[PDB]
Amino acid sequence: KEWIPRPPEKYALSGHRSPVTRVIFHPVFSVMVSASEDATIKVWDYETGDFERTLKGHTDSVQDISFDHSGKLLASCSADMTIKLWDFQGFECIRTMHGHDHNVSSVSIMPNGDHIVSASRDKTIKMWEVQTGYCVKTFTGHREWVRMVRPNQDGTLIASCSNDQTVRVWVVATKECKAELREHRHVVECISWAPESSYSSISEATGSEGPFLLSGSRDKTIKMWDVSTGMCLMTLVGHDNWVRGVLFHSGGKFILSCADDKTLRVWDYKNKRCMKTLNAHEHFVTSLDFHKTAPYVVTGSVDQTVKVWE
């Protein structure tokens, strides 16, 4: 079931009043969501493109978005230091979660839709109970700004990302940390975990007689890794500016990438090559997402558009 990552943009959705921060596909409906410094969450229709709805109620900026498994709850993040939980019965905000002392630049609903993880300039990662809005666990760690947090498909683990040029993988239960991944030259802005394609070993499978993650930095470098050994295994030696998004394709043929080099990259870690490039925007591409099921990619930047690709 091979896939097409390319052409010229087949829908460009304008509407936000300010840079777009994150783009997100809904797990079920033919709809996709976008966040901005607006500070607004907006909802399109990627099949058709329609201003569907706007979600208002943050004070300063919307930095991250994350849907629960069911596609019925949406968490958001802001420079208000809040973490709003939204109901996709369509409208209302449910809870507002207060803890972080500064900018909150990443959030995620964990798989057992019972917890939320966030990360902040706090230098903090916090864990909130969805149905009580309580802060439950706080991960003290890096010496600087934390930029991203990601769960592990299994829910067991957490990957964090920060200004101290470091990637940490934490144990969600014990709050110990199995690994600190060090060999980045500048701030790391990105993390993705590898899925149904741990076949990728092929490209580096020797040693003698595991779990993986990509990191995009302001090196303009995406680094592959395994947590287990602490070695990075790759470095996608790349295009021209701060890297901003990383994304293993539906399977594991390709890695997708976007950055401040006003561009979206599809790599071939099928032996290091970078198999295609598209100039997607007229200012930094801020983020992307690939659909796990359907032939569409979204992409949002600072020229305040959301672009849809086939």
Partner: protein, 218 residues
């Protein structure tokens, strides 16, 4: 005690409180952005953003622009003193102020800039500073073409003391042999055209790029 170097917020006399509006916008920009390069100054700096050449040269540099039109040294000072220098840690700062400083002698003006520079490398010791020289003005020769020139003079002399500063006194062919400035270079004989800025920006960019390539672990 030199008047051009006493910080001073511009009173709004018009009603729409636009000066403060802009300042706030910047403060706000200082709270959660994080640039490599920072341009501060007056209209010359402000207007630069409006032209195609800004998205072409400095946009990819992660650059902020804190320019306000008609600002004087006194104003820029106050602005810098009241929080346009917090939280950010730019690698390079470009200062371009002075040509709106009627009411001060050349000497005083140079003092102003110098004070600005002083402040900058106090609050931002890591930053390498470029000061763009004052540009000629007016269709035909005049007192002010002279004033600005002096300022440049004094700066060439007094800036190579003081840490991490250099003057970049660009001169594109803004004055011809007959001593006239073409309105194809300055549409109102003061503010630059697209064409004009290209004469300024080429070398400026070229320099910054140098300074950036100097040290990258921030």
């Amino acid at each position: 005690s030199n008047p051009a170097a006493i910080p001073h917020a511009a009173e709004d006399i018009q009603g729409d409180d636009r000066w403060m509006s802009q300042h706030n916008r910047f403060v706000l920009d200082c709270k959660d952005k994080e640039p490599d390069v920072l341009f501060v100054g007056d209209s010359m700096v402000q207007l630069m953003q409006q032209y195609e050449i800004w998205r072409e040269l400095f946009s990819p540099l992660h650059a902020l622009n804190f320019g306000i039109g008609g600002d004087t040294t006194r104003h820029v000072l106050w602005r810098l003193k009241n929080g346009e220098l917090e939280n950010i840690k730019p690698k390079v700062i470009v200062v371009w102020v002075g040509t709106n400083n009627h009411e001060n002698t050349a000497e005083e003006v140079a003092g102003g800039i110098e004070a600005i520079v002083q402040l900058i490398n106090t609050r931002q010791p890591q930053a390498k500073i470029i000061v763009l020289g004052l540009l000629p003005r007016g269709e035909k020769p005049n007192p002010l073409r002279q004033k600005n020139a002096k300022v440049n003079q004094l700066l060439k002399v007094s800036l190579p003391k003081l840490a991490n500063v250099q003057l970049l006194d660009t001169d594109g062919g803004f004055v011809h042999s007959d001593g006239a400035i073409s309105c194809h270079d300055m549409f109102d004989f003061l503010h630059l055209t697209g064409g004009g800025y290209a004469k300024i920006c080429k070398p400026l960019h070229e320099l910054i790029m140098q300074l950036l390539e100097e040290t990258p672990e921030e």
